[PDB]
Amino acid sequence: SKIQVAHSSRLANLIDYKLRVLTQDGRVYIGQLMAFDKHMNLVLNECIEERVPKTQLDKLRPLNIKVEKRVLGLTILRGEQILSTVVEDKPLLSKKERLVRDKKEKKQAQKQTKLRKEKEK
Amino acid sequence: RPKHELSRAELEELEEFEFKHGPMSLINDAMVTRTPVIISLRNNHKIIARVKAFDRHCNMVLENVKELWTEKKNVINRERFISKLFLRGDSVIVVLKTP
Amino acid sequence: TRYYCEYCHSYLTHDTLSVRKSHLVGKNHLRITADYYRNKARDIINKHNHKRRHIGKRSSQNETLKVTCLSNKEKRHIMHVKKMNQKELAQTSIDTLKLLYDGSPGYSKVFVDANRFDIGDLVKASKLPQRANESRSRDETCESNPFPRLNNPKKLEPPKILSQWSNTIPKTSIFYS
Amino acid sequence: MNGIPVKLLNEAQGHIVSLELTTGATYRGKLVESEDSMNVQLRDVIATEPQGAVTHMDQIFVRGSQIKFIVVPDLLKNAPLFKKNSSRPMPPI
Amino acid sequence: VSTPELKKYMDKKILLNINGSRKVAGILRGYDIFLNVVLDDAMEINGNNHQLGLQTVIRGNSIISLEALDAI
Amino acid sequence: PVNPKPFLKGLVNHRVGVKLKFNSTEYRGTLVSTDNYFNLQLNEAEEFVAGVSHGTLGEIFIRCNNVLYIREL
Amino acid sequence: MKLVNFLKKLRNEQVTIELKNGTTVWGTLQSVSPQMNAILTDVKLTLPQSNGIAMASLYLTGGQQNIASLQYINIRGNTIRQIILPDSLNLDSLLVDQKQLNSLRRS
Amino acid sequence: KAMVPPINCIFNFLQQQTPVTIWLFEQIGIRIKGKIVGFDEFMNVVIDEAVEIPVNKGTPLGKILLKGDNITLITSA
Amino acid sequence: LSKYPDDVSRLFKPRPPLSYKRPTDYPYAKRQTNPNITGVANLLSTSLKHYXXXXXXXXXXXXXXXXXXXXXXXXXXXXXXXPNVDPHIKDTDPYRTIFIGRLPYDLDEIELQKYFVKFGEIEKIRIVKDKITQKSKGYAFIVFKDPISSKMAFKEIGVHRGIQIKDRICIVDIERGRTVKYFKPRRLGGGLG
RNA sequence: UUUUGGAAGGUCUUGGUCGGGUGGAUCUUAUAAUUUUUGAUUUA
RNA sequence: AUACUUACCUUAAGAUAUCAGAGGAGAUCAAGAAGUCCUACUGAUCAAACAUGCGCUUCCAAGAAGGACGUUAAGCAUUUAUCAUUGAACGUUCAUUGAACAUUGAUGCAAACUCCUUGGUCACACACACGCGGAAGGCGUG
Ligand SMILES: [Zn+2]
């Protein structure tokens, strides 16, 4: 997929990436992680869940693989029944764009606190 | 005594005394007298090796690991030498120690 | 310990189940809540796409057509009209079969909204606490309304028409009332 | 305390969620009240057994540690829980 | 830490699905912070029936879910 | 009256029997020591594969996890 | 006394990992979490001779075309069954545990 | 009536010393029948006069510290 | 519907009910780990077929610190067995000695007299020094002539224990090298405050 | 004569224009016992 | 906004680099604890941010990548569309009684069309060898 994932990044740095998290069942969830926690409960935006069927599993044995996708959208997956997560797509907006966006979010937040201080007066 | 009720910083010593004079005295013996033990695991992997460290969780470093299991379909018994291993204690069923 | 309510921008000094339930049912929370969710949707619908539109590089361009701009007052007016009309088209449902089956033997079990058994126990349970001061149900049978055209019902309502094309109707209907 | 995802599950109260269970059952219905321990209570529940049938519970209470995931509605994509920078209005004293 | 919200089901006939095919119907006499559940008049339903004595208590690990058979 | 820790204290120095979770395997030996997490350290144990001995084991250590119960013989 | 700290001394070291599933994983540790969520760049991972759930969990992780070559795999702690260290590494150096030393001086 | 929580119910059930059909976790688990002589918080239950009967000639087992997690279900037979 | 109508109807407008078909996992009856578990007693042969044991050497590295701590404590106890024979201590009454410590270095002995003559006539005074540096160590031993002004010098309200001798607060005790039953100095695990 | 370091000037390129019973984040400890990390998902 | 009333609730703990010395806490007993603790002290390693490079490495225009929760499409091949009791006829068929999604599906094999979203459709040049500013990562220095 030649995506070249950041060699020194873990979960909090992986935010808004498009993941391919894999579970104990062998089902795959694909989508933007928007949040995790201590127990690895993930949210997953626009998520699609794919299985292989039992029948297509025979072809998977030691190729074109009719994976079955249902569309779960905004789901919020659990840390108990997962196995492992990888990264599939990079996010939409680049590091400069994410950086300028975070600057604007912080300026707006400081401004809202100034407005709270004004209404408190 | 209850676990919160012990204190801070007694708790480590109370674990260590539980290690020396508890059920842990087989893994206590095996690390200090370097005798080989035989770990049976949940996935049929018998393991014959010498123990380097202990855990509360029975996370165990193992050195010069023999491991051996059984492919039952007939049977081929397969063995593998793994020299430096770190084994989680969840899989560990029973630690047998030879004299 | 502290439960920050992101909508209310207030705190709960010590989290427990009962102050959470009582806060999330609280009318102040529901009002700021509804304002926020409406607000996020009207922002996302308002927010223009503004794609990059990577312009390619290209004889047969001989025809030239006149663009049509508008005045800034005219822009703001037609945008306001479109806002009101989107808000109508989303909200409006179609009555008809309520007004059609008005006299029916089992209208008052089926369309009267919590006598249906399926959604029925909801609307009793979804009723809000009525702490401030100030139904046609299953009892209705056939012999309640024996003859509907004795006691005059209103006619079937005349169908609705786009005002943009209201000028282009058939003038002078056959058969005056 | 909670952390972001179970706070989201505390947010999506009274709205149409869909749960897979570890058995493969995917309940679906309105979410009466979730707890912090992810025990979730649901209403007007339409259920899919592992065998492929469908039935209708009225009033289910599925335990948290057999939830496979839960799907909330789409709009909570845009939620103030996700805002990384919203500053705190002077915590109580 | 939080005790579960089975207060609405306090006397109403509930149906546990226990473990994956065990289905037990009783009346919810009790609940603790683990969803250990005390049922009265447990009557295990196989798809044949089998009654389960006067009182019973069922492990909150084994319990998957429970339905209110009684109206609320 | 009795709880698992008093029964387990009094269990010490007895030919104990241990059914694991799995019913394939049971260890009959003399109980040496037990923690608060109910880990089991035993001596000169005896295997039973579905009931029949496959050998005498020696001093042995079961994790608290895999054992379904312990009995006094 | 926990041994995850041992693994925390092992950033940029090349191990293999066998999972409770049966998946075998080859590729360096970039870090390790408190409860042993081990993140691993430059993986190629294999499944020895078979488990159908493991077959699905192998293929579906992208770049299968049964060695699957992946840039970056986070692995959850309760999936890691056993982890094979490099034999070049000296265990006498790592198990010394400066925290356990300080605690001996704390006593 | 009132609430009968599980801890207090098993203690009442311990005083009365009535017989117990205790069940187990899955297909391996063998239905034990006994009389409770005591429990704990982790639901490790020392049961007296145990008779194990396979899943559908029950054999005695004596007195047992039964582990907590393997229990599915207590009943009074 | 829920409490407010507008966004519950329009905005949230949730997901389609989702398509189901056949799972891959096992439908509870067979979730098993491994009921066919090993029968270890065969492997008691193969360890003979396994046949030295490598040096542990890390528990040695901790055991060196533990043994050094016990050896330093034992050297302490050897200094504990090894104060009537001592020539610095004068065989006066122990009850008429007052100990002072936390003393400034440049404090002259005549000043020590001057702060101490207020209560009783002083018999003799030994301020303790290093024997190799000859810096004043910071503590001194005073015997008065009576016990009662040693006690009034021990009773401290407005006086000694808290007096600022050469712009520093000092500490003022009865001598416990002779008096109390179990006393060890700082070198010997004891000491006060 | 060469190398290194510091200073100054000129030229080019890129970027910008002390306290706190405060909260949050990370890591330890309760916390290896039924609810996510100390295993009941290689189906025997 | 203010007042009044009611209901509910009021504190898990600790740390924020690590190691070795300088000095302090100038250690309450006859010259000394050991240790442990702190620091605008120093030295070493590590982590984070920022800047700069790497004659770093890779990816950037009818087609290429991804998707269709679209069709052609009942395309073709295969399979399946409850149990129990009683009566009758020669295991089957029919009838009665009691109990509990969908065939145009499902599964496999493809193939084609149409549609969708993204991208430096850059600057230079259009020629016979054996460029700047973008995006993602690695390393180095400060
Ligand atoms: Zn609120």
Rounded Cα gap, residues I69 and I122, in angstroms: 44
Give the bases of strand K that a protein CB approaches within 7 Å.
7-14, 18-19, 26-37, 47-48, 50, 58-59, 61-62, 67-69, 100-101, 106-110, 117-123, 134-139
CB < 8 Å to E30, chain H: 3-6, 8-9
Distance separating the N- and C-terminal Cα atoms of chain B: 35
Q: Which class for I70: exposed (0-12), middle (13-18), buried (19 or more C-beta within 10 A)?
A: exposed
In contact, I174 and I98? CB cutoff 8 Å: yes
Rounded Cα gap, residues E55 and E47, in angstroms: 23
Query: Residue E70: which domain range?
Result: 1-72
Q: Which of C1, C17, C24 to probe the E interface (max E CBs under 10 A)?
A: C17
- G32 Cβ contact partners less than 8 Å away, ≥ 6 residues apart: G4, G7, G8, G10, G38, G39
- Is CATH 2.30.30.100 correct for D1-93? yes
Contacts by F34-38, CB closer than 8 A, 24 or more apart: F34/B22, F34/B23, F34/F8, F35/B18, F35/B22, F35/B23, F35/B24, F36/B18, F36/F5, F37/F64, F38/F4, F38/F8, F38/F64, F38/H44, F38/H67
Q: Give me the residues paired with residue B48 across strands.
A: B38, B66
Q: Which of F61, F62, F65 to probe the B interface (max B CBs under 10 A)?
A: F61
Of B63, B60, B68, the closest CA to residue B40 belongs to: B68
Q: What was the elucidation method? A: cryo-EM
Amino acid at position H37, single letter? V
Residue reference for tokens 């993140």:
G39
Rounded Cα gap, residues C120 and A119, in angstroms: 46
Per residue in E25-60, is it b (16+ CB within 10 Å) or e — as a string?
bbbbbbbbebbbbbbbebebeeeeeeebbebbbbbb
What stretches of G1-107 adopt beta strand conformation (E)?
13-19, 24-29, 38-46, 68-75, 80-84
- G99 Cβ contact partners less than 8 Å away, ≥ 6 residues apart: G5
Q: Which class for G6: exposed (0-12), middle (13-18), buried (19 or more C-beta within 10 A)?
A: buried
Q: Is the CB of G53 under 7 A from strand J?
A: yes
Number of C–E residue contacts, CB under 8 Å = 4
What are the backbone dihedrals phi and psi of residue C158, each rounded to the nearest 5 degrees, phi first? -75, 140
Going from the Cα of C5 to the center of ligand 1, the distance in angstroms, rounded, reads 5
**CA-to-C1' distance for C17 and K13, Å?**
24
Going from the Cα of D44 to the center of ligand 1, the distance in angstroms, rounded, reads 27
Contacts by I121-127, CB closer than 8 A, 24 or more apart: I121/I145, I121/I146, I121/I149, I123/I92, I123/I96, I124/I90, I124/I92, I126/I88, I126/I90, I127/I103
Record: contact D87-A112, CB cut-off 8 A: yes
Rounded Cα gap, residues F12 and B27, in angstroms: 19
Rounded Cα gap, residues A90 and A101, in angstroms: 17
Instruction: List the alpha helices (DSSP H) in F1-73.
Output: 4-11
Q: Is the CB of G54 under 7 A from strand J?
A: yes
**CA-to-C1' distance for A22 and K18, Å?**
37
Record: contact H9-E18, CB cut-off 8 A: no
Of E11, E68, E18, E14, the closest CA to residue E46 belongs to: E18
Tally the domains of chain E.
1
Amino acid at position G21, single letter? N
Give the CATH number, domain containing residue E33: 2.30.30.100
SS3 I184: coil
Record: contact C34-I7, CB cut-off 8 A: yes
Distance separating the N- and C-terminal Cα atoms of chain E: 27
The residue of chain B nearest to residue I59, with distances taken between CA atoms, is B32
CB < 8 Å to H45, chain F: 4
Going from the Cα of C23 to the center of ligand 1, the distance in angstroms, rounded, reads 6
Q: Which of residues 38-67 of B touch strand J (CB under 7 A)?
A: 41-43, 55-59
Which helix (H) or strand (E) segment is I122 a member of?
Answer: strand I122-129
- What is the sign of the dihedral through the CA atoms of A97, A100, A104 and A110? positive
Query: Per 3-state DSSP, what percentage of chain E is helix, strand, and coil (rounded to 5)?
Result: 5, 50, 45
Rounded Cα gap, residues C37 and G100, in angstroms: 53
Q: Is the CB of D64 under 7 A from strand J?
A: yes
Tokens of G99: 């925290």
Q: Give me the residues paired with residue H71 across strands.
A: H24
Domains and CATH numbers, chain B: 1-99 (2.30.30.100)
Q: Which of residues 2-61 of E touch strand K (CB under 7 A)?
A: 47
Rounded Cα gap, residues D32 and C144, in angstroms: 39
**CA-to-C1' distance for A37 and J2, Å?**
62
Rg (CA), chain H: 12
Distance separating the N- and C-terminal Cα atoms of chain D: 19
Residues 80-119 of A with CB under 8 A from I: none
G55 at A interface, C-beta within 8 A:
yes
User: Residue F57, CB half-sphere, CA atoms under 13 Å: how many?
Assistant: 30
Rounded Cα gap, residues G38 and G32, in angstroms: 4
Neighbours of I35 (CB within 10 A): 14
Domains and CATH numbers, chain F: 1-73 (2.30.30.100)
Q: Which among A25, A53, A71 has the least Cβ separation from residue I22?
A: A53
SS3 I39: coil
The interaxial angle of helices G98-106 and I59-81, nearest 10 deg, is 20
Rounded Cα gap, residues D49 and C145, in angstroms: 46
E5 at C interface, C-beta within 8 A:
yes
Q: Which of residues 1-40 of A touch strand J (CB under 7 A)?
A: 12, 24-25, 38-40
In units of Å, what resolution does this entry have?
4.0
Q: Which of G2, G3, G8 to probe the B interface (max B CBs under 10 A)?
A: G3
Amino acid at position G11, single letter? R
The interaxial angle of helices B25-32 and B11-20, nearest 10 deg, is 80
Going edge to edge, which strands form the sheet with I136-144?
A: I122-129, I136-144, I97-101, I171-174
Q: Kindly list the distances between the CA atom of residue C156 and the CA atoms of C96, C146, C148, C159, C173, in Å, as whole numbers in the listed order.
A: 9, 20, 14, 9, 17
Amino acid at position B51, single letter? V
Provide the residue ranges of all domains of chain D, joining segments of one domain with +.
1-93
Residues 21-40 of C with CB under 8 A from D: 21, 24, 36-37, 40
Provide the residue ranges of all domains of chain H, joining segments of one domain with +.
1-77
Neighbours of G106 (CB within 10 A): 10
The 3 state secondary structure assigned to B46-70 is EEEEEECCCCCCCCEEEEEEEEEEE
Of F71, E50, E19, the closest CA to residue H34 belongs to: F71
Q: Is the CB of A15 under 7 A from strand K?
A: no
- What is the sign of the dihedral through the CA atoms of I107, I111, I117 and I122? positive
Q: Kindly list the distances between the CA atom of residue A36 and the CA atoms of A10, A13, A48, A78, D39, in Å, as whole numbers in the listed order.
A: 11, 11, 18, 10, 19
Of C154, C153, C118, C116, the closest CA to residue C137 belongs to: C116
Going from the Cα of C22 to the center of ligand 1, the distance in angstroms, rounded, reads 10
Rounded Cα gap, residues I98 and I177, in angstroms: 11
SS3 D57: coil
CATH number of H1-77: 2.30.30.100
Which helix (H) or strand (E) segment is A104 a member of?
Answer: helix A95-120
In contact, H33 and H18? CB cutoff 8 Å: no
Record: contact B97-F40, CB cut-off 8 A: no
